[PDB]
Each structure stands twice: as structure tokens, then as C-alpha cells.
């Protein structure tokens, strides 16, 4: 059975996600419009930039994150932002469409749209297979939120200083997730291990995306289409 | 009477402007849309960024600019870009509307729109008075183009190294403008001196705009709405 402090963690984590993920997607109309040359890079740059702001907002409400040093907060967000974006995007992904559908057909993204923003199938094929296998997991909101917080608070990320403290935070969160699945998820005997595998998959997607981001950001005619926030977060500064 | 080399300068300068100013404004639909908090800063950031690219393209076709060192090219563009944007924008300005009208009502900019991008009447009132007095000048395309090239190739700008060479280029261009007005502009006895006054006005508008840009760029929640190109060009790096 779950403890009261374990459930407060779940509560504040669910509230943090509802405050930072807007299921109406009505904010997307103020991105630079999509074009279907890298015709999709402006719109996807704005989507990712907007998403980074929401991840930062989510992190700030993870119990204990706000108490990390600013350098550790930055270090965790610089290494994990792209992974949390891939995880959180599962909420718009459709198994039927094999795409991310954000309200309108203007904001429905195919693999092919992402190729017109500079990425290759070396990234997009593992990414779509990741989305589908994650979507088939049929996670409760509690579990999806916990996995994002676990991903964010991983200590084996370059740049972290207070390894012990953030690993203790991640331990707490993992213990919550394991208990939640056991008590509250019928037939989830294998679910915790599957979700931990997904964390491994995200590392691999992070590395490929970082490879392909370096190729973009070294071409100023493309990097100039990015936003300041994207340049800061995906950049290589320490 | 005008010489053949003087008229080749006029020719290549008019061609350079037609290649870099699109009177259809159809590119404006891919800016982040206008909102009427700094609701207009995203759209105006994209307008200015787009405009900087066109000024760079215009400069590259000024006779002699391309032969300057890259550092002198950069130095001239960093100090003059905002002035050339103010000059070139006269082509969309309407005396009847007291605004810049770029095709559609979506892309019609009031003084009030520019205040919702962070600027104050300390800038906008002199700027609008500048536009109207420039518009009343009723310049020929030849003269408008020459004034932009003269403005760009001014040597009294911080950072310039080959002062002698770019002043010789500006002398050539001024001699062209003086001859053109005398031969080709009926009743323009006083026009050359008025246009030189406008160059002085632009310095004053440059200084105020730079003051107000510093206040924006020191607030990261606003500067993050700018583009990489705007940050580079209006930035203080050398």
C-alpha cells in the first residue's frame, strides 16, 4: 500500500504536469507557421522552444529540484530536456496516424515533417518506434508523470555536482513508481522494468539527436532559424 | 550631366534594392503572427530579422562594399543596419495612415503596435516624424537607393578600420547623388542638403533605439523572443 508522502509526491507531480501541458494546443498558432530547404525548421524550432519552457516549469515543481544548485538544475535540464520532450510528446502521438496530432491538421506532424526540419531516419525511425511502444504501455497519468520526473532527476548526466542528493531524489521517485504500479496498475507485473527500458531508449535517442543537432548548429543558415532558448539548452556551453 | 560610371552605380544600386525589397510582402505570413506583455515583440522581432537579411543582401551589391574586409563589412552593418531599416521602411509608410502598411491589415503597424514590442514614444515620436518628413521629400527611387548606400558606407562608425577606402566610396556616392538631383530632379535645389540632414536624424534615432534595445536585451524573458540574427547584429560584440 502507498504512503501519504508517496501520494503527495504523485499529487504535486500530476499538478505540475497539468500546469505545464495544455491539451488545447491553442498556443501553437503563435509559432512560425509550418511549411510542407528545411521548410519545417522554423515551426519545429518554435515548438521545441515552447516545450523547453514547459519542461523547465515542470522541473521547478518536482519536489527537491528547486533546492538543487542552479548549476545542477541547469546541468540536468541541458542533458534531459530533449528526452523529456520526447516523453511528453507521447500525449499527442496517435497509434492510428503514426504521428503527433496537436489539435488541428496544421499541427499534425509526420515523420516527413520532421525530415524537413533537418533530421534523418536514423533518428526518426527509432523515435517513432519509441512512441508506439511507449503508447502501447498504456501508462496511467501518474506513471507518465513519474517517468518524466525520474528521467529529469537522473544523476548519470554530464555536469552534475551533487550526485548523491539527486540520486536520493530519483530513488524516492522510483520507489513511488514501483509501489504505484504494484498497488494500482492491474496486470503491471512487468511494467516497471519496461519503463526503465524506455529510459535507456531515451539515452540512445538523445545521443542521435545530439549528433544531428551538431550538424544543424554548425550551418549558420540553419542555426539562425533556431531560438535563443534552444541554442542555450541544446548548446555545448557549461 | 551624369557620367557613364555614375549611372552604372545608380543602375546596380537600383537593381540591388529591387532584388532585396519585395513589394508583395508575401514573406510576412511566415513571421510569428502579430498580437494586439509585449504582444508584438515576436512578430516585430521576425520583421526586423528578415529586414536585416535584406540589408546584408543590399550591402553585398553596393559597388566596393564586397571588397572591404569582413571586419569592416561587419562593422558597417552592425552600426548602420537599424538606420537602413528605418530608411527602407519609408517605402511602406503611409502619410494618410501615419503607419507602415505592408499589404494586409495584419501587417499594418501603428505607433501603438511598436509600443507593444518594448519601445517608447521617446523613440517612436521622432521615428514617425522622420518617416513623414522623408516621405514628403518625394524621393526618386534612384535617390532613395543612393541615400541607403551612402548611409551604409559612412566611415564615422565605431569599429571601422579602412576609414580612407570607405570614405572614398561614400564620396563617389555623394557626388552621384548631387549630380542626379541637379540634372534629374526638377526643383530639387535644396534636396541634397535635406537628405544629408536626414542622415543626421538617423544617427539620433540609432542612439535612442540602441538605448532602448539595451533595456530589452537585459531582460532575458524579452531577449529570448529575439532572433539569433538580431542578437548578433544589434549586440555589443566586436
Amino acid at each position: 500500500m502507498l504512503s501519504d508522502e508517496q501520494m503527495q509526491i504523485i499529487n504535486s507531480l500530476v499538478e505540475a504536469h497539468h500546469k505545464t501541458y495544455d491539451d488545447s494546443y491553442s498556443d501553437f498558432v503563435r509559432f512560425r507557421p509550418p511549411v510542407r530547404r528545411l521548410s519545417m525548421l522554423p515551426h519545429l524550432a518554435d515548438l521545441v522552444s515552447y516545450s523547453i519552457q514547459k519542461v523547465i516549469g515542470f522541473a521547478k515543481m518536482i519536489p527537491g529540484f528547486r533546492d538543487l544548485t542552479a548549476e545542477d538544475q541547469i546541468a540536468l535540464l541541458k542533458s534531459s530536456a530533449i528526452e523529456i520532450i520526447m516523453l511528453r510528446s507521447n500525449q499527442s502521438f496517435s497509434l492510428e496516424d503514426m504521428s503527433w496530432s496537436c489539435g488541428g491538421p496544421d499541427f499534425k506532424y509526420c515523420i516527413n515533417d520532421v525530415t524537413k526540419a533537418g533530421h534523418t531516419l536514423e533518428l526518426l525511425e527509432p523515435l517513432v518506434k519509441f512512441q508506439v511502444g511507449l503508447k502501447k504501455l498504456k501508462l496511467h497519468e501518474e506513471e507518465h508523470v513519474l517517468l518524466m520526473a525520474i528521467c529529469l532527476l537522473s544523476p548519470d548526466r554530464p555536469g552534475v555536482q551533487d550526485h548523491v542528493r539527486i540520486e536520493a531524489l530519483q530513488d524516492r521517485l522510483c520507489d513511488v513508481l514501483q509501489a504505484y504500479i504494484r498497488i494500482q496498475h492491474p496486470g503491471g507485473r512487468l511494467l516497471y522494468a519496461k519503463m526503465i527500458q524506455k529510459l535507456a531508449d531515451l539515452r540512445s535517442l538523445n545521443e542521435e539527436h545530439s549528433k544531428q543537432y551538431r550538424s544543424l548548429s554548425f550551418q549558420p543558415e540553419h542555426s539562425m532559424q533556431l531560438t535563443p532558448l534552444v541554442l542555450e539548452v541544446f548548446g555545448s556551453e557549461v | 550631366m551624369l557620367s557613364d560610371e555614375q549611372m552604372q552605380i545608380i543602375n546596380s544600386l537600383v537593381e540591388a534594392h529591387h532584388k532585396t525589397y519585395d513589394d508583395s510582402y508575401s514573406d510576412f505570413v511566415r513571421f510569428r503572427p502579430p498580437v494586439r506583455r509585449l504582444s508584438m515583440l515576436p512578430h516585430l522581432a521576425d520583421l526586423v530579422s528578415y529586414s536585416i537579411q535584406k540589408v546584408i543582401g543590399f550591402a553585398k551589391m553596393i559597388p566596393g562594399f564586397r571588397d572591404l574586409t569582413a571586419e569592416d563589412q561587419i562593422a558597417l552593418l552592425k552600426s548602420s543596419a537599424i538606420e537602413i531599416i528605418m530608411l527602407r521602411s519609408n517605402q511602406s509608410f503611409s502619410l494618410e495612415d501615419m503607419s507602415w502598411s505592408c499589404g494586409g491589415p495584419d501587417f499594418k503597424y501603428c505607433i501603438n503596435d511598436v509600443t507593444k514590442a518594448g519601445h517608447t514614444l521617446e523613440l517612436l515620436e521622432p521615428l514617425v516624424k522622420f518617416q513623414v518628413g522623408l516621405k514628403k521629400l518625394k524621393l526618386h527611387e534612384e535617390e532613395h537607393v543612393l541615400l541607403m548606400a551612402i548611409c551604409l558606407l559612412s566611415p564615422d562608425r565605431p569599429g571601422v578600420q579602412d576609414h580612407v577606402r570607405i570614405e572614398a566610396l561614400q564620396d563617389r556616392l555623394c557626388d552621384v547623388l548631387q549630380a542626379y538631383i541637379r540634372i534629374q530632379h526638377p526643383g530639387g535645389r535644396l534636396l541634397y542638403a535635406k537628405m544629408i540632414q536626414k542622415l543626421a536624424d538617423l544617427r539620433s534615432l540609432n542612439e535612442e533605439h540602441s538605448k532602448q534595445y539595451r533595456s530589452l536585451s537585459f531582460q532575458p524573458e524579452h531577449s529570448m523572443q529575439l532572433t539569433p540574427l538580431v542578437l548578433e547584429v544589434f549586440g555589443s560584440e566586436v
Partner: peptide, 10 residues
Amino acid sequence: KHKILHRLLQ
């Protein structure tokens, strides 16, 4: 460094 990140992290 990380001007925007610092700002957003409050």
C-alpha cells in the same frame, strides 16, 4: 552563461 535558463529557473 545560460542567461535565459537562469532567468526561467527564477
